[PDB]
Design a protein around this ligand. Structure first.
Ligand SMILES: O=C(O)C(=O)Cc1ccccc1
Ligand SMILES: O=C(O)C(=O)Cc1ccccc1
Ligand SMILES: [Co+2]
Ligand SMILES: [Co+2]
Lengths: 381, 381
């Protein structure tokens, strides 16, 4: 059941913005590790005396990396005369964010029909304003409200190429890396209390709870009308044998924040081969693979969807497989992206629900907790 | 003339420490870009609740990357009970350094016979103390004095494997990258006034001015007794046609600091081939190459040291060649390592002065300014 209750017209995920200490080094690392190309920049060379911002793209996935310059470069400016290309940027906010959280996501940006309308409707319905609507070069409108912790939900709307003031990068500096990643599937937040977080966000968006199917966590997923913008939120479960990883996140992050980004691949086997080739030469590491008994148990569960060879390929790459009643989910998780055990990345590919593929086909992996434990009985074997 | 006036026994350069916002991403980027292997770590997994530190090595070159965790992880600790492996580390100093300067070198570390003696003699001779001598696990002694700006000269002495509390990394995570770099040749600082900087540093070390052979800068080089520890210092020259790049550095860095590291290669052609292969896939970029007329003019200057083919190879890789009366210097400069136009890297290889190779063989490139301008007359050609 999807009541289609969006209080304003939402299109798709637009970009994810990381707040960094040094945008250059994070962007270069992510580009090599994930196979994303450098596609746009806004920095000193484009006249921006406030922040350095670099955009990586893979298909429709857009990762923006931003870091502040010395405030002294822009000390004469006021907001009416700013050289910042992202008018919501603030030196103090950015330094405070990074000192508090380390490297992480500041903005989850979605494209909407009218960012000014989305902002007004959101705040009228309880959203905490973060940055009011601003029209850039009479062409793009940008506005921000608080999502959870210090993460903002960013609205972007276009009258009719990233943002005004960004330049496409010299293709001599733009190497056409591509490991198969194509779009952001969903973005997951961690909060101390799930109930109030859901009420707040569902309150100002009109997003509905996405229909799904005892260790660590509870969660729920908020979804837009066509269920293409998907926002799961986790809370810790206290008192368990193993300490809740959600609680570990909250401790090391200094509170609520974005936990992970799920990136859709058009070919998850190619993506994982290419990413694993680079893990120890500047790329990303992956979580330890499930035991072989997990893959022995895969035939009974998805032997009608994957061949023996395709299953053996899952075992080689450490891929996890889950399934609801509409589709199948292939997934894998990286180790944390930076120093703290906070943010990480998931790679996914979904099988089924065609007609295009409907959002959330196969779910979010609710069945992989019990399948993993009832598989770690390989201790005996 | 070298008076051999070192006020304490200095051995060689030991390591360079970068202060970062996220040590993981900077270290991974540098590892791939420069061909350095991950060799040691001190972080949460080793019991350090204060800072994350990762060591890269190539030959005898040691690059350490350090970033602070949330202070809350260590809020119960006091200095007597610290879990930091580097006792001079301070959360506030590190965050203040990075907010002020961005990514850069905090410590230039040299090995000495007795770090406690070196510290005492230095401070007795005018050195501003930064961190007093501390004995780690009854095995290593570490002390720090101010060098210039917020950069410290770090003394390390060993009774008899980096530092106690560091662990050698799992060789599954340690890929044996190597593009030919073997040691730190020299480390260059930028200051507003050269005179007082030289007097201060030569004052407390006893380092002497190294014997060498109108645009932008003046400099001088301080050297240890065997001239293996080499510390050039630059000051801006004001009022010139083109604005002094030293002054640009000082503006974007918020004052004095380390400008560049010169890394010796055992095979500069291999190093540059390998680094240039990776420039647009996560590595480092290089300064624009000199015009072909520069290389046309190379035969007359170093045709007795390099073959036509070796000269053509210099032209392919953009290598600069200088020469004093004792040896020849091959060199090249990277673009800035991070967001700000501040720190960069030089790759060098020296030819001559054998007997081992004496320090500074070929100089530091004093002759490449005039050779470059008188070559940019290729405009006519
Ligand atoms: O909310 C969800 O749908 C998740 O899957 C979140 C999650 C997944 C794995 C570890 C911790 C949280
Ligand atoms: O001090 C020196 O020996 C230098 O070469 C410093 C330097 C080199 C190139 C550009 C700016 C400063
Ligand atoms: Co997920
Ligand atoms: Co130099």
């Amino acid at each position: 059941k999807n009541p289609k209750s969006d209080k304003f017209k939402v299109k798709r995920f637009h970009h994810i913005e990381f707040w960094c200490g040094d945008a250059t080094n994070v962007a270069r690392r992510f580009s090599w590790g994930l196979g994303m190309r450098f596609s746009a920049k806004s920095d000193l060379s484009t006249g921006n005396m406030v922040h350095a911002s670099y955009l990586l793209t893979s298909g429709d996935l857009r990762f923006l990396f931003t870091a502040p310059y010395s405030p002294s470069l822009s000390a004469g400016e006021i907001k009416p005369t700013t050289t910042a290309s992202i008018p919501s940027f603030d030196h103090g906010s950015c330094r405070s964010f990074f000192s508090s959280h380390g490297l992480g996501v500041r903005a989850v940006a979605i494209e909407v029909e009218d960012a000014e309308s989305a902002f007004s409707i959101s705040v009228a319905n309880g959203a905490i304003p973060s940055s009011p609507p601003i029209v850039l070069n009479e062409a793009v409108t940008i506005a921000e409200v608080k999502l959870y912790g210090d993460v903002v939900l960013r609205y972007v709307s276009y009258k009719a190429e990233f943002l005004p003031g960004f330049e496409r990068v010299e293709d001599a500096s733009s190497f056409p890396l591509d490991y198969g990643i194509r779009r952001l599937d969903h973005a997951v937040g961690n909060v101390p209390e799930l109930g109030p977080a859901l009420t707040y966000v569902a309150g100002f968006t009109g997003f509905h709870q996405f229909a799904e199917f005892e260790s660590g966590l509870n969660s729920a997923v908020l979804a837009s009308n066509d269920e293409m913008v998907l926002l799961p939120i986790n809370e810790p479960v206290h008192g368990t044998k193993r300490k809740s990883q959600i609680q570990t996140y909250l401790e090391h992050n200094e509170g609520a924040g974005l936990q992970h980004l799920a990136l859709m691949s058009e070919d998850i086997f190619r993506t994982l081969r290419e990413m694993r080739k680079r893990s120890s030469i500047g790329g990303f590491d992956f979580m330890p693979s499930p035991p072989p008994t997990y893959y022995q148990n895969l035939k009974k569960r998805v032997g009608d969807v994957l061949s023996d060879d395709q299953i053996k390929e899952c075992e080689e790459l450490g891929i996890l497989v889950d399934r609801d009643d509409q589709g199948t989910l292939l997934q894998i998780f990286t180790k944390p992206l930076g120093d703290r055990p906070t943010i990480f990345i998931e790679i996914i590919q979904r099988v089924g629900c065609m007609m295009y593929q409907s959002g959330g086909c196969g779910g979010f992996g609710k069945g992989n907790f019990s399948e993993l434990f009832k598989s770690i009985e390989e201790y005996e074997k």
